Amino acid sequence: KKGSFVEMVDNLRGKSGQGYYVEMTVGSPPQTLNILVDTGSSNFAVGAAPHPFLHRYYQRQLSSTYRDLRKGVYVPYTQGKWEGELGTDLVSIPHGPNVTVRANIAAITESDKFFINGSNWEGILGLAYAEIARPDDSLEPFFDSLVKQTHVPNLFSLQLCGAGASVGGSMIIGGIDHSLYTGSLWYTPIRREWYYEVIIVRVEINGQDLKMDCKEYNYDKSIVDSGTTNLRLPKKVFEAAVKSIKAASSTEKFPDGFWLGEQLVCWQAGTTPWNIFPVISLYLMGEVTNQSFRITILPQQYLRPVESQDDCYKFAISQSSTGTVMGAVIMEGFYVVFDRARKRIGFAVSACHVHDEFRTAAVEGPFVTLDMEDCGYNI
Ligand SMILES: COc1cccc(CN2C[C@@H](C(=O)N[C@@H](Cc3ccccc3)[C@H](O)CNCc3cccc(N(C)C)c3)NC2=O)c1
Ligand SMILES: [Cl-]
Numbered sequence: 001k002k003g004s005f006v007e008m009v010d011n012l013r014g015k016s017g018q019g020y021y022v023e024m025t026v027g028s029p030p031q032t033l034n035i036l037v038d039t040g041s042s043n044f045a046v047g048a049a050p051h052p053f054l055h056r057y058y059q060r061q062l063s064s065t066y067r068d069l070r071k072g073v074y075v076p077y078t079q080g081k082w083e084g085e086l087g088t089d090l091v092s093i094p095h096g097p098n099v100t101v102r103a104n105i106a107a108i109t110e111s112d113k114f115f116i117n118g119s120n121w122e123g124i125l126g127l128a129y130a131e132i133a134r135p136d137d138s139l140e141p142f143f144d145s146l147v148k149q150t151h152v153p154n155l156f157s158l159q160l161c162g163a164g165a166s167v168g169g170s171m172i173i174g175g176i177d178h179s180l181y182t183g184s185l186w187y188t189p190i191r192r193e194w195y196y197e198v199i200i201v202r203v204e205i206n207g208q209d210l211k212m213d214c215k216e217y218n219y220d221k222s223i224v225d226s227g228t229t230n231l232r233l234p235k236k237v238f239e240a241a242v243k244s245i246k247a248a249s250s251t252e253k254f255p256d257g258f259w260l261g262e263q264l265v266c267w268q269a270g271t272t273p274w275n276i277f278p279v280i281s282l283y284l285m286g287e288v289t290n291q292s293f294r295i296t297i298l299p300q301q302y303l304r305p306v307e308s309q310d311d312c313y314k315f316a317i318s319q320s321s322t323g324t325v326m327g328a329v330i331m332e333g334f335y336v337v338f339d340r341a342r343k344r345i346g347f348a349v350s351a352c353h354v355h356d357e358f359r360t361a362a363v364e365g366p367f368v369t370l371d372m373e374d375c376g377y378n379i
């Protein structure tokens with residue numbers, strides 16, 4: 001088995017807070033575009049018409065292999081939205097596996113709060129499941145096509161590396177790079193194939209249990225989404241966590257506006273008091289019954305740096321109304337394997353994650369845990 005994907009390592013770039021993107025080409029001849037890797041979506045969409053924030057776009061009339069599906073589509077995100085027309089064309093991933101597949105493409109022609117100013121990406125690659133793709137489930141997502149058409153295993157892995165202003169990382173398509181992690185890989189089942197839904201069974205702050213019905217941890221749902229920057233948490237859980245994180249960091253008090261992400265905090269260049277902030281742990285349901293494992297992040301993860309003579313950051317743990325979102329603040333600590341064939345998601349300490357001399361993120365297990373099925377929410 002291949003354990004070294006030399007060509008795919010370091011194929012991701014991005015700017016802090018604006019997502020990670022991979023270079024792709026569409027059309028004949030190939031048109032190069034930077035695409036946002038978003039495991040919280042299932043639509044492959046690219047800018048397909050002029051827009052001030054786009055350095056370049058997809059020109060359908062210049063592609064021989066272009067085909068119009070003669071159908072429209074729009075997609076509402078959390079705050080940004082776009083509208084386009086469906087079609088298909090050949091697509092590639094230069095620094096990915098050497099193959100060219102035909103996939104569905106939403107040519108974006110109208111958008112709002114979508115493309116960012118100077119983001120450097122021009123499209124979005126939703127890697128989730130068909131179940132949530134617009135217009136409806138019959139529009140086969142990109143990864144699904146790539147799989148049926150080539151001999152690439154049904155699985156991709158992601159190592160997102162923060163920093164402390166250009167992020168990086170690698171998206172290994174079809175396999176697992178042993179160079180990207182240390183220790184062992186722990187798997188949590190994928191509850192349902194729509195978003196990448198998992199189940200959190202216990203939460204800890206510097207070792208101290210949050211002590212809540214574990215149903216509150218997955219209230220609505222919990223998903224791994226590289227398309228979200230923060231560690232979004234349900235209203236009730238978010239409340240408990242900030243109280244705890246505040247008690248733990250009490251050596252220094254901060255304006256209520258910090259804990260709300262509204263305002264950032266600063267410290268003399270390189271004197272950030274990391275040690276005063278607690279570590280955060282999430283126990284995920286493991287594969288064997290009554291077994292769970294633990295993933296732990298550091299302030300370096302949830303205190304996202306933001307562009308003086310100081311190092312400033314903003315709190316990256318926000319409240320959410322739609323369940324828990326394990327955003328980049330979570331992901332950046334691990335090498336995350338989206339083993340789709342075996343309906344599970346693996347976590348391992350990331351070999352690039354940002355940390356100081358004394359602490360490191362971690363993944364430990366197993367922990368004898370009972371009654372985990374009831375940690376999941378149902379309609
Ligand atoms: C990817 O990192 C980022 C890049 C730019 C901006 C941001 C900030 N915001 C955007 C925001 C947000 O809208 N995130 C979605 C991806 C995205 C990024 C930037 C612009 C537009 C869309 C992500 O897919 C959300 N997943 C849950 C979700 C919500 C609503 C609808 C769906 N569907 C239809 C399946 C799915 N998440 C953020 O954290 C993050
Ligand atoms: Cl090897």
Ligand SMILES: [Cl-]
Nearest residue numbers: 005006007008
């Ligand atoms: Cl390779």
Ligand SMILES: [Cl-]
Nearest residue numbers: 069071086139
């Ligand atoms: Cl269609």
Ligand SMILES: [Cl-]
Nearest residue numbers: 082110111112
């Ligand atoms: Cl729009």
Ligand SMILES: [Cl-]
Nearest residue numbers: 273274275356
């Ligand atoms: Cl420190």
